[PDB]
Design a protein around this nucleic acid. Sequence first.
RNA 1: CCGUGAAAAGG
Length: 454
Amino acid sequence: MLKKNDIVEVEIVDLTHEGAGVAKVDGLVFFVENALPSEKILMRVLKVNKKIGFGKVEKYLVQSPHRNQDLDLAYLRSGIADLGHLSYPEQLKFKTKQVKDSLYKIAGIADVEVAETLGMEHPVKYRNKAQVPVRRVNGVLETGFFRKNSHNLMPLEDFFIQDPVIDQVVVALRDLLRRFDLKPYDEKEQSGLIRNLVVRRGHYSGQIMVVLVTTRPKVFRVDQLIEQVIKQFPEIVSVMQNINDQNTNAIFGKEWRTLYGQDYITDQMLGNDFQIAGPAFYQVNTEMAEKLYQTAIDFAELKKDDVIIDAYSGIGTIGLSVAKHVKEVYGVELIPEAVENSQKNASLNKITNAHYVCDTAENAMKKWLKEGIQPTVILVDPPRKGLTESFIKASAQTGADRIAYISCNVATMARDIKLYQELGYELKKVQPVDLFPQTHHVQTVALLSKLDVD
RNA sequence: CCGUGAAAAGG
Ligand SMILES: Nc1ncnc2c1ncn2[C@@H]1O[C@H](CSCC[C@H](N)C(=O)O)[C@@H](O)[C@H]1O
Ligand code: NI
């Protein structure tokens, strides 16, 4: 039978969720990276069980017409750009296909129109944030990205999909951590000082926050290292320290300190100014977030008398960008630093009709139900894991006739939609947006609508 | 799920 690195000619017939190539081999399904439909490869088997297997391209016999390369002294996987070998138009078609397929396979919904993916004019160098691990590799302190399904660091200077300024700051920081001989983190030995570098840069403002993620409070010569980097990049207005002392894959720990300047940067979205703290979420592709937000606004058909609840509000980018053309905005957030951004961001743009709280989304709804606040619309933008049942049910009991659900994960979105249908919400429209070009990730906005009156 | 373009291990 087929066993580890036997060699076999196969033809790819489809692309998985992750963008891996599917091949059939004598009853078995094989998954293989950097192989597009139509391509014929010699395939070396990596592992094979009963049913499923994994394979690697030994040689390309015939390459797809849709392959990029061409481009270009790769950029070869790394982890960053797992759809980068695909031309950009086929990326869009793939993401549209992924939304239809999940809607059907999980929600059971065959009967809805899924618009084609709204692509990016220049789908490169788009990321306003870099979270870079710092490790010891072949003697030397290195910045880079983990290989898929590993914590094997691949040294890197060019990151392809990042704002190129962020790239330079990371390389400058790397050169300064070598020269001041600061000690990189080691996961196994549980030793060292420098765990991660985080660099965020305003898309419109150009203001940079640097975060040093470290295992301990004390960093020898930190002020001298700040002074050097601030000389090279005078757009740096914030240098912060995060202390993460735990054996965990979470990048950030509990404690934050300001080593230099402010503990926020300012950026603009939709002509409103927003202050952004280090641990607050901010969409990593601003240009496309602006179209995603606009899309959500147009789906929701707001009027001057509407009362919006902004669940999972963050720093209130959605909330406050609708606040001018509605009656009231009510927002719930998880982490204080972001709510205090919210209240300050309201103040900053002279918005009196937006009301933020700290809480879980469920409780603020419970409090708002008892308080007598009657919302017309619900805007939710949850993380990858989606919504909880408890939130879905509490949201459906407000009588809100419209729900705009913004999602960065179709799997959970669909599950959540299926629930909302059993509580009298019909899925009216769905619009994928390409927030993460060259990756398998897809951003969607779905509009949900009250039929029943209950 | 902790867990955030990648994100082992361990819960
Ligand atoms: N159960 C819950 N209740 C309220 N907020 C939550 C939550 N779970 C996660 N969150 C928060 O919801 C946010 C999702 S990110 C959405 C923020 C917004 N689009 C922006 O651009 O700023 C995160 O900040 C997260 O901390
Ligand atoms: Ni995925």
